[PDB]
Amino acid sequence: MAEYGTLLQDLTNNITLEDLEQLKSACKEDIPSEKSEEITTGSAWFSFLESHNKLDKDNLSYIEHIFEISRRPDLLTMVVDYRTRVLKIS
């Protein structure tokens, strides 16, 4: 659980204001436009993905897809690498 939140913060730091707009566009169908106006940070965008039951805490294949279609292998890698590390932890 803490690892999930931690990842979101690590991702947020690697998201620019322009990328945020692109990410909001990527999830324009998942997050209501009224709620996309409430987004000021990457962490806000992430919090709506949780609030709207779009990104699972354990299943991060959703956000990996979003980063794929957003053309950010870097952000995708952050999730894949981190998630793998968490899976290794036992």
mmCIF file of N, CA and C in Angstrom:
data_model
loop_
_atom_site.group_PDB
_atom_site.id
_atom_site.type_symbol
_atom_site.label_atom_id
_atom_site.label_comp_id
_atom_site.label_asym_id
_atom_site.label_seq_id
_atom_site.Cartn_x
_atom_site.Cartn_y
_atom_site.Cartn_z
ATOM 1 N N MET A 1 0.824 -1.203 0.000
ATOM 2 C CA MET A 1 0.000 0.000 0.000
ATOM 3 C C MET A 1 0.860 1.256 0.000
ATOM 4 N N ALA A 2 1.820 1.311 0.917
ATOM 5 C CA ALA A 2 2.740 2.439 0.999
ATOM 6 C C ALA A 2 3.593 2.546 -0.258
ATOM 7 N N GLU A 3 3.932 1.399 -0.835
ATOM 8 C CA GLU A 3 4.713 1.363 -2.067
ATOM 9 C C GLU A 3 3.951 2.004 -3.220
ATOM 10 N N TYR A 4 2.645 1.768 -3.264
ATOM 11 C CA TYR A 4 1.793 2.364 -4.286
ATOM 12 C C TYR A 4 1.832 3.885 -4.216
ATOM 13 N N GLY A 5 1.589 4.425 -3.027
ATOM 14 C CA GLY A 5 1.630 5.868 -2.818
ATOM 15 C C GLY A 5 3.011 6.430 -3.131
ATOM 16 N N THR A 6 4.046 5.707 -2.717
ATOM 17 C CA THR A 6 5.420 6.127 -2.965
ATOM 18 C C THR A 6 5.693 6.269 -4.457
ATOM 19 N N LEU A 7 5.266 5.274 -5.228
ATOM 20 C CA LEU A 7 5.439 5.298 -6.676
ATOM 21 C C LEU A 7 4.780 6.527 -7.289
ATOM 22 N N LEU A 8 3.559 6.818 -6.851
ATOM 23 C CA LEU A 8 2.805 7.948 -7.380
ATOM 24 C C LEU A 8 3.564 9.255 -7.190
ATOM 25 N N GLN A 9 4.223 9.389 -6.044
ATOM 26 C CA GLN A 9 5.032 10.568 -5.759
ATOM 27 C C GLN A 9 6.264 10.619 -6.654
ATOM 28 N N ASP A 10 6.912 9.473 -6.826
ATOM 29 C CA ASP A 10 8.081 9.376 -7.692
ATOM 30 C C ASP A 10 7.722 9.688 -9.139
ATOM 31 N N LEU A 11 6.536 9.257 -9.555
ATOM 32 C CA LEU A 11 6.033 9.567 -10.889
ATOM 33 C C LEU A 11 5.730 11.052 -11.032
ATOM 34 N N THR A 12 5.081 11.619 -10.020
ATOM 35 C CA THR A 12 4.701 13.026 -10.045
ATOM 36 C C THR A 12 5.910 13.919 -10.295
ATOM 37 N N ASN A 13 7.031 13.577 -9.670
ATOM 38 C CA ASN A 13 8.246 14.375 -9.785
ATOM 39 C C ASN A 13 8.781 14.362 -11.211
ATOM 40 N N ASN A 14 8.390 13.350 -11.975
ATOM 41 C CA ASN A 14 8.880 13.184 -13.339
ATOM 42 C C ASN A 14 7.831 13.610 -14.358
ATOM 43 N N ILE A 15 6.803 14.307 -13.885
ATOM 44 C CA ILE A 15 5.749 14.808 -14.760
ATOM 45 C C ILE A 15 5.740 16.331 -14.792
ATOM 46 N N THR A 16 5.879 16.893 -15.988
ATOM 47 C CA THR A 16 5.839 18.340 -16.164
ATOM 48 C C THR A 16 4.409 18.838 -16.327
ATOM 49 N N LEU A 17 4.242 20.155 -16.324
ATOM 50 C CA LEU A 17 2.924 20.761 -16.474
ATOM 51 C C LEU A 17 2.322 20.440 -17.837
ATOM 52 N N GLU A 18 3.172 20.399 -18.858
ATOM 53 C CA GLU A 18 2.737 20.038 -20.202
ATOM 54 C C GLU A 18 2.353 18.566 -20.280
ATOM 55 N N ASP A 19 3.181 17.712 -19.688
ATOM 56 C CA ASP A 19 2.900 16.281 -19.640
ATOM 57 C C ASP A 19 1.628 15.996 -18.852
ATOM 58 N N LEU A 20 1.408 16.769 -17.795
ATOM 59 C CA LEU A 20 0.181 16.666 -17.013
ATOM 60 C C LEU A 20 -1.048 16.896 -17.884
ATOM 61 N N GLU A 21 -0.988 17.924 -18.724
ATOM 62 C CA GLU A 21 -2.073 18.221 -19.651
ATOM 63 C C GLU A 21 -2.284 17.079 -20.637
ATOM 64 N N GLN A 22 -1.187 16.465 -21.066
ATOM 65 C CA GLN A 22 -1.251 15.330 -21.979
ATOM 66 C C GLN A 22 -1.805 14.093 -21.282
ATOM 67 N N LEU A 23 -1.456 13.931 -20.010
ATOM 68 C CA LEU A 23 -1.927 12.796 -19.226
ATOM 69 C C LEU A 23 -3.410 12.928 -18.902
ATOM 70 N N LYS A 24 -3.845 14.154 -18.634
ATOM 71 C CA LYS A 24 -5.261 14.440 -18.442
ATOM 72 C C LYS A 24 -6.053 14.176 -19.717
ATOM 73 N N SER A 25 -5.450 14.491 -20.859
ATOM 74 C CA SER A 25 -6.051 14.187 -22.151
ATOM 75 C C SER A 25 -6.126 12.683 -22.384
ATOM 76 N N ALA A 26 -5.072 11.975 -21.991
ATOM 77 C CA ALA A 26 -5.037 10.522 -22.110
ATOM 78 C C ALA A 26 -6.172 9.878 -21.325
ATOM 79 N N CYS A 27 -6.461 10.429 -20.151
ATOM 80 C CA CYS A 27 -7.560 9.943 -19.325
ATOM 81 C C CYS A 27 -8.723 10.926 -19.323
ATOM 82 N N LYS A 28 -8.997 11.515 -20.483
ATOM 83 C CA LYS A 28 -10.109 12.446 -20.625
ATOM 84 C C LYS A 28 -11.446 11.720 -20.563
ATOM 85 N N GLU A 29 -11.420 10.419 -20.829
ATOM 86 C CA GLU A 29 -12.630 9.605 -20.798
ATOM 87 C C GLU A 29 -12.823 8.957 -19.434
ATOM 88 N N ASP A 30 -11.743 8.874 -18.665
ATOM 89 C CA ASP A 30 -11.783 8.240 -17.353
ATOM 90 C C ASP A 30 -12.016 9.267 -16.253
ATOM 91 N N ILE A 31 -11.423 10.446 -16.415
ATOM 92 C CA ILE A 31 -11.631 11.544 -15.479
ATOM 93 C C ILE A 31 -12.480 12.645 -16.100
ATOM 94 N N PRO A 32 -13.606 12.949 -15.463
ATOM 95 C CA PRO A 32 -14.512 13.977 -15.958
ATOM 96 C C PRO A 32 -13.786 15.301 -16.161
ATOM 97 N N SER A 33 -14.171 16.027 -17.205
ATOM 98 C CA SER A 33 -13.524 17.291 -17.540
ATOM 99 C C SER A 33 -13.641 18.289 -16.395
ATOM 100 N N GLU A 34 -14.731 18.193 -15.643
ATOM 101 C CA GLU A 34 -14.924 19.030 -14.463
ATOM 102 C C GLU A 34 -13.886 18.721 -13.394
ATOM 103 N N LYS A 35 -13.447 17.467 -13.346
ATOM 104 C CA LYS A 35 -12.447 17.041 -12.375
ATOM 105 C C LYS A 35 -11.036 17.293 -12.889
ATOM 106 N N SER A 36 -10.893 17.334 -14.210
ATOM 107 C CA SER A 36 -9.618 17.674 -14.831
ATOM 108 C C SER A 36 -9.275 19.142 -14.617
ATOM 109 N N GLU A 37 -10.298 19.954 -14.370
ATOM 110 C CA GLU A 37 -10.097 21.351 -14.005
ATOM 111 C C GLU A 37 -9.665 21.484 -12.551
ATOM 112 N N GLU A 38 -9.942 20.454 -11.759
ATOM 113 C CA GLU A 38 -9.565 20.444 -10.351
ATOM 114 C C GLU A 38 -8.131 19.963 -10.168
ATOM 115 N N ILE A 39 -7.557 19.412 -11.232
ATOM 116 C CA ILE A 39 -6.178 18.938 -11.200
ATOM 117 C C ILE A 39 -5.197 20.089 -11.381
ATOM 118 N N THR A 40 -4.311 20.265 -10.407
ATOM 119 C CA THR A 40 -3.255 21.266 -10.502
ATOM 120 C C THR A 40 -1.877 20.619 -10.461
ATOM 121 N N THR A 41 -1.818 19.397 -9.940
ATOM 122 C CA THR A 41 -0.562 18.662 -9.853
ATOM 123 C C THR A 41 -0.701 17.265 -10.443
ATOM 124 N N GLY A 42 0.429 16.590 -10.626
ATOM 125 C CA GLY A 42 0.430 15.196 -11.050
ATOM 126 C C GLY A 42 -0.194 14.297 -9.990
ATOM 127 N N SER A 43 0.043 14.630 -8.726
ATOM 128 C CA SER A 43 -0.505 13.861 -7.616
ATOM 129 C C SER A 43 -2.024 13.967 -7.569
ATOM 130 N N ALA A 44 -2.545 15.122 -7.968
ATOM 131 C CA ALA A 44 -3.985 15.311 -8.096
ATOM 132 C C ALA A 44 -4.562 14.415 -9.184
ATOM 133 N N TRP A 45 -3.898 14.385 -10.335
ATOM 134 C CA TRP A 45 -4.298 13.510 -11.429
ATOM 135 C C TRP A 45 -4.309 12.051 -10.992
ATOM 136 N N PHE A 46 -3.273 11.649 -10.263
ATOM 137 C CA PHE A 46 -3.174 10.286 -9.757
ATOM 138 C C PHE A 46 -4.290 9.984 -8.764
ATOM 139 N N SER A 47 -4.626 10.972 -7.941
ATOM 140 C CA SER A 47 -5.620 10.790 -6.891
ATOM 141 C C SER A 47 -7.010 10.582 -7.479
ATOM 142 N N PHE A 48 -7.239 11.149 -8.658
ATOM 143 C CA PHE A 48 -8.504 10.972 -9.361
ATOM 144 C C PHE A 48 -8.585 9.598 -10.012
ATOM 145 N N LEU A 49 -7.439 9.087 -10.450
ATOM 146 C CA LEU A 49 -7.358 7.736 -10.991
ATOM 147 C C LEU A 49 -7.708 6.697 -9.933
ATOM 148 N N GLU A 50 -7.338 6.979 -8.689
ATOM 149 C CA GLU A 50 -7.744 6.149 -7.561
ATOM 150 C C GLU A 50 -9.204 6.387 -7.199
ATOM 151 N N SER A 51 -9.595 7.656 -7.142
ATOM 152 C CA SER A 51 -10.944 8.024 -6.728
ATOM 153 C C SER A 51 -11.989 7.429 -7.663
ATOM 154 N N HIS A 52 -11.670 7.392 -8.952
ATOM 155 C CA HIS A 52 -12.611 6.922 -9.961
ATOM 156 C C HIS A 52 -12.400 5.444 -10.266
ATOM 157 N N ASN A 53 -11.631 4.774 -9.414
ATOM 158 C CA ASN A 53 -11.414 3.338 -9.544
ATOM 159 C C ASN A 53 -10.875 2.985 -10.925
ATOM 160 N N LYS A 54 -9.885 3.746 -11.380
ATOM 161 C CA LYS A 54 -9.304 3.537 -12.701
ATOM 162 C C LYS A 54 -7.948 2.852 -12.604
ATOM 163 N N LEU A 55 -7.130 3.300 -11.657
ATOM 164 C CA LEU A 55 -5.836 2.677 -11.405
ATOM 165 C C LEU A 55 -5.852 1.879 -10.108
ATOM 166 N N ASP A 56 -5.705 0.564 -10.226
ATOM 167 C CA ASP A 56 -5.668 -0.311 -9.060
ATOM 168 C C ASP A 56 -4.363 -0.149 -8.291
ATOM 169 N N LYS A 57 -4.415 -0.403 -6.988
ATOM 170 C CA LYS A 57 -3.253 -0.224 -6.126
ATOM 171 C C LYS A 57 -2.211 -1.306 -6.375
ATOM 172 N N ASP A 58 -2.673 -2.483 -6.783
ATOM 173 C CA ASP A 58 -1.784 -3.613 -7.022
ATOM 174 C C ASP A 58 -1.572 -3.842 -8.513
ATOM 175 N N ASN A 59 -2.641 -3.690 -9.287
ATOM 176 C CA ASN A 59 -2.569 -3.853 -10.735
ATOM 177 C C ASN A 59 -2.263 -2.529 -11.424
ATOM 178 N N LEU A 60 -1.004 -2.344 -11.805
ATOM 179 C CA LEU A 60 -0.542 -1.062 -12.325
ATOM 180 C C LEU A 60 -0.421 -1.095 -13.843
ATOM 181 N N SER A 61 -1.032 -2.101 -14.459
ATOM 182 C CA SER A 61 -1.012 -2.237 -15.910
ATOM 183 C C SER A 61 -1.779 -1.104 -16.580
ATOM 184 N N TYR A 62 -2.728 -0.527 -15.851
ATOM 185 C CA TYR A 62 -3.490 0.613 -16.348
ATOM 186 C C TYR A 62 -2.581 1.802 -16.628
ATOM 187 N N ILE A 63 -1.839 2.227 -15.610
ATOM 188 C CA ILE A 63 -1.016 3.426 -15.711
ATOM 189 C C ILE A 63 0.165 3.208 -16.647
ATOM 190 N N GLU A 64 0.608 1.959 -16.750
ATOM 191 C CA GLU A 64 1.622 1.585 -17.729
ATOM 192 C C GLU A 64 1.121 1.801 -19.151
ATOM 193 N N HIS A 65 -0.120 1.400 -19.403
ATOM 194 C CA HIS A 65 -0.761 1.654 -20.688
ATOM 195 C C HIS A 65 -0.869 3.149 -20.964
ATOM 196 N N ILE A 66 -1.306 3.900 -19.959
ATOM 197 C CA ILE A 66 -1.479 5.341 -20.098
ATOM 198 C C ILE A 66 -0.163 6.022 -20.454
ATOM 199 N N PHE A 67 0.914 5.592 -19.806
ATOM 200 C CA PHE A 67 2.238 6.141 -20.071
ATOM 201 C C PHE A 67 2.752 5.703 -21.436
ATOM 202 N N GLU A 68 2.361 4.504 -21.855
ATOM 203 C CA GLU A 68 2.679 4.017 -23.191
ATOM 204 C C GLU A 68 2.068 4.909 -24.264
ATOM 205 N N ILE A 69 0.765 5.144 -24.159
ATOM 206 C CA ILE A 69 0.044 5.926 -25.156
ATOM 207 C C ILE A 69 0.352 7.412 -25.017
ATOM 208 N N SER A 70 0.912 7.791 -23.873
ATOM 209 C CA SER A 70 1.357 9.162 -23.656
ATOM 210 C C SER A 70 2.779 9.366 -24.162
ATOM 211 N N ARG A 71 3.372 8.301 -24.689
ATOM 212 C CA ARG A 71 4.711 8.375 -25.263
ATOM 213 C C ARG A 71 5.737 8.793 -24.217
ATOM 214 N N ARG A 72 5.696 8.140 -23.061
ATOM 215 C CA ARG A 72 6.686 8.370 -22.016
ATOM 216 C C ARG A 72 7.219 7.055 -21.462
ATOM 217 N N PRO A 73 8.138 6.439 -22.198
ATOM 218 C CA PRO A 73 8.763 5.197 -21.761
ATOM 219 C C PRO A 73 9.408 5.356 -20.391
ATOM 220 N N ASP A 74 9.871 6.568 -20.098
ATOM 221 C CA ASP A 74 10.514 6.855 -18.822
ATOM 222 C C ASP A 74 9.557 6.623 -17.659
ATOM 223 N N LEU A 75 8.377 7.229 -17.741
ATOM 224 C CA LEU A 75 7.365 7.077 -16.703
ATOM 225 C C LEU A 75 6.854 5.644 -16.635
ATOM 226 N N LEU A 76 6.679 5.027 -17.799
ATOM 227 C CA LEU A 76 6.322 3.616 -17.873
ATOM 228 C C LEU A 76 7.352 2.749 -17.160
ATOM 229 N N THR A 77 8.625 2.989 -17.454
ATOM 230 C CA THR A 77 9.709 2.226 -16.847
ATOM 231 C C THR A 77 9.708 2.377 -15.332
ATOM 232 N N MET A 78 9.462 3.596 -14.864
ATOM 233 C CA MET A 78 9.395 3.869 -13.432
ATOM 234 C C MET A 78 8.411 2.935 -12.740
ATOM 235 N N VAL A 79 7.262 2.720 -13.371
ATOM 236 C CA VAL A 79 6.237 1.843 -12.818
ATOM 237 C C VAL A 79 6.657 0.381 -12.904
ATOM 238 N N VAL A 80 7.103 -0.033 -14.084
ATOM 239 C CA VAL A 80 7.477 -1.422 -14.319
ATOM 240 C C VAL A 80 8.628 -1.843 -13.414
ATOM 241 N N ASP A 81 9.662 -1.010 -13.354
ATOM 242 C CA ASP A 81 10.836 -1.304 -12.542
ATOM 243 C C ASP A 81 10.483 -1.357 -11.061
ATOM 244 N N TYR A 82 9.772 -0.338 -10.591
ATOM 245 C CA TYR A 82 9.400 -0.248 -9.184
ATOM 246 C C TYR A 82 8.489 -1.400 -8.780
ATOM 247 N N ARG A 83 7.473 -1.658 -9.597
ATOM 248 C CA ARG A 83 6.539 -2.747 -9.337
ATOM 249 C C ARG A 83 7.263 -4.084 -9.255
ATOM 250 N N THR A 84 8.199 -4.302 -10.173
ATOM 251 C CA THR A 84 9.011 -5.514 -10.166
ATOM 252 C C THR A 84 9.779 -5.655 -8.859
ATOM 253 N N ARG A 85 10.360 -4.553 -8.397
ATOM 254 C CA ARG A 85 11.101 -4.547 -7.141
ATOM 255 C C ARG A 85 10.200 -4.905 -5.967
ATOM 256 N N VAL A 86 8.986 -4.366 -5.974
ATOM 257 C CA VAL A 86 8.005 -4.672 -4.939
ATOM 258 C C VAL A 86 7.627 -6.147 -4.956
ATOM 259 N N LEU A 87 7.494 -6.704 -6.155
ATOM 260 C CA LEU A 87 7.192 -8.122 -6.311
ATOM 261 C C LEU A 87 8.325 -8.990 -5.779
ATOM 262 N N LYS A 88 9.555 -8.519 -5.953
ATOM 263 C CA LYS A 88 10.724 -9.221 -5.434
ATOM 264 C C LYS A 88 10.733 -9.225 -3.910
ATOM 265 N N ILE A 89 10.286 -8.122 -3.318
ATOM 266 C CA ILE A 89 10.207 -8.011 -1.867
ATOM 267 C C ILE A 89 9.171 -8.969 -1.295
ATOM 268 N N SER A 90 9.616 -9.856 -0.412
ATOM 269 C CA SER A 90 8.726 -10.830 0.209
ATOM 270 C C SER A 90 9.340 -11.405 1.480
#
